[PDB]
Amino acid sequence: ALLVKLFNGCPLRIHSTAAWTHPSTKDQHLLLGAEEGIFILNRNDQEATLEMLFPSRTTWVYSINNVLMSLSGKTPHLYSHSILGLLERKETMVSTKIQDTKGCRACCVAEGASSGGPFLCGALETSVVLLQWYQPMNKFLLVRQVLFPLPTPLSVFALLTGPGSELPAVCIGVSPGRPGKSVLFHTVRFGALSCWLGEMSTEHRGPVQVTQVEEDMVMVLMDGSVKLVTPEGSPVRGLRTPEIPMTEAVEAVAMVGGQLQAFWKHGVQVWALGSDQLLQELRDPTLTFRLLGSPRPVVVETRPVDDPTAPSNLYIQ
Numbered sequence: 389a390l391l392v393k394l395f396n397g398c399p400l401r402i403h404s405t406a407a408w409t410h411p412s413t414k415d416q417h418l419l420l421g422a423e424e425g426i427f428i429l430n431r432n433d434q435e436a437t438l439e440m441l442f443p444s445r446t447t448w449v450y451s452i453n454n455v456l457m458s459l460s461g462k463t464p465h466l467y468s469h470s471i472l473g474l475l476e477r478k479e480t481m482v483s484t485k486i487q488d489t490k491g492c493r494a495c496c497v498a499e500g501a502s503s504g505g506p507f508l509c510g511a512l513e514t515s516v517v518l519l520q521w522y523q524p525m526n527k528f529l530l531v532r533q534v535l536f537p538l539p540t541p542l543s544v545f546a547l548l549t550g551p552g553s554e555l556p557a558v559c560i561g562v563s564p565g566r567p568g569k570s571v572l573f574h575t576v577r578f579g580a581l582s583c584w585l586g587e588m589s590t591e592h593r594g595p596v597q598v599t600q601v602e603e604d605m606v607m608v609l610m611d612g613s614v615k616l617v618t619p620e621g622s623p624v625r626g627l628r629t630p631e632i633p634m635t636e637a638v639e640a641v642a643m644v645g646g647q648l649q650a651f652w653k654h655g656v657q658v659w660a661l662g663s664d665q666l667l668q669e670l671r672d673p674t675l676t677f678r679l680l681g682s683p684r685p686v687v688v689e690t691r692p693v694d695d696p697t698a699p700s701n702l703y704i705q
Contacts, residue, residue: 389668390656390670390705391656391688391705392704393703394429394436395429395438395701396701397701398438398699398702399699400423400424402421402422402689402700403448404420404421404446404447404448404449404450405419405421405449405687406418406419406449406450406681407685408471417429418687418702418704419471421447421458422445423445424440426440426442426449426456426460427440427441428475442460442467444461446458447459447464448494451471452506452521453526454471455528456468456469456470459495464491465486465489466485466486466492467485468483468484468486468527468528469483470483486519486530488517488530488533489510492510492517493542495509495511496546497509497547498547498549498556498600500549502551502603503553504520506520507521507547507556509545511536511538513538514535514536515535516533516538516558516578518530518531518555534578536581537560537581537582537583539561544559544561544562544596544597544598546559547559548598548619549600550618550619553619555577557575557576557577557578558575559573559574559575559598560574562596562610563589564610564611566623570615570617570622570623571610571615571617572621573606573619592610592611593611594612594637595609597641599642599643601643601683604618605618605619605624606621607642609638612634612637613632614632614641614659615630615631616630624662627661627662628663629664630663632659634650636652636657638650639652639653642679642682642683644683644686644705647659647667648660649682649683649705651677652677654671654672654676654693655670655671656669656688674692674693675691676692676693676694677689687703688702688704689703690703
């Protein structure tokens, strides 16, 4: 009804997805970070093929132009890959390990924008690394490494950028603020050493998610609700009612066409604007749904309930 099938019976264990379009061509290819390695999804006519590009286990994947960034290896490192190079090594290294990223547990992205980004932030043990996009070399460069108070286990790990921020800041948690209107972000600027005590609610209740969707708007999933707030955590005035209660046990959310897409164990819901309608909805108790990537593109995974051993089907939005 809403989801378009990409692949039938995927035997891979997929952790992360990102998109890429071949220059001088039309169709974008899906890049997949899997336990089995990095794959590209090709499609000649009505046949889809998953082609391996990089053999190391991969938990995180990200592309900009013709560069693929990845978190890979049994001992994790941040990598950069030439996508064209990877492809040319499979036609019938181009892959560089990045310094000081050994043991990296997680990477988040900030799409600049006024700050001369994009920016990558990798979490280590007692420190974080900050990488900045450097166009003249089409390369991310490590501009700052700093000691940082990292929770264990990592929960929220996102980059927030307010207007006027020269650099993004690190958000490693979120808490309730004004009941049903605002949130309190746990953001630490680079070089600062802060943490939050007391009512450090052990994982609130269930699913939590912090995702900056606009220069001055952050999407927050917390305590069965989705709030649209400023990067400082204030409610976004203009327009009205920036909160949407979740009817389902929503696990993940995304902002796509200015619309809110929610994902839960047995479905996908679409919501409109600042909070009003409910547009489309996909429900199926026989299928276990799982968000793989968002918002560009949205990639969703299904399996028969409840057979996690089974191969999966892949979809786009």
